[model samples]
Target: GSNFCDSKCKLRCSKAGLADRCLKFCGICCEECKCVPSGTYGNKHECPCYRDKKNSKGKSKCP
Candidate 1:
């Protein structure tokens, strides 16, 4: 299924306390992954991009 990121992702990230750090990347990843998790963490299973994406430092880069 395709879930792509949208305004809802931002809202989610904001509620998850990641809006300042993960908003932009979350949107990017969500767009490719098609969806985002419902909470702050431990729900990457919903989107591969959100689950696999990494930063330059090899750290998880999704909200």
Candidate 2:
């Protein structure tokens, strides 16, 4: 079963200034979280897993 990461990431990254990198990062998050936010940015609240992730240093892990 596909998680539909490709198309969802495309939509997520469409308005990103760093679209390719956004897709790369979004793909990782979407795989683990199974959701993508609904806009270009600033809606991490729309996806808790996307919102709450952080690296060991505590910086946001997802773009």
Candidate 3:
């Protein structure tokens, strides 16, 4: 289910301009956590491992 992250993250990051770092990071986080939150934003608490993984901006690395 590794590629699962590639396809799963693709849907979550389908906001067009949400690319660049968003999709790439999404794949990384999703691959490790094996979870993908619903929707393109927020609702992060759906996944434990993904929810608290903050990035350099002090925000969720899952989105």
Instruction: Indicate which candidate wins on lDDT.
Output: 2
- Writing each residue's lDDT as its tens digit, candidate 1 over 1-63 gives 334466657656766554655677778777667778876667778777678888799998776
Misplaced by over 4 Å in model 2 are 1-3
lDDT of 2 by residue, 1-63 (tens): 355788878888898898888999989888889888887777889899988877789988777
lDDT measured at residue 56 in model 2 versus the true structure, 0 to 100: 85
Candidate 1 scores a C-alpha RMSD against the true structure in Å of 3.7
Q: Which digits, one per residue and each the tens of the lDDT, describe model 3 over residues 1-63?
A: 557788878878888475858788888898789888878877778878878888799876677
What TM-score does each of the candidates earn?
A: 0.64, 0.83, 0.76
Question: lDDT, candidate 1, residue 24?
Answer: 77
List the candidate numbers ranked by lDDT, top first. Answer: 2, 3, 1
lDDT of 1: 0.70
Task: Please list the C-alpha lDDT of all candidates, in the order they appear.
Answer: 0.70, 0.84, 0.80
Best by TM-score: 2
| Model 1, residue pairs in steric clash | 3-34, 4-34
The positional error of residue 16 in candidate 2, measured at the CA in angstroms, is 1.5
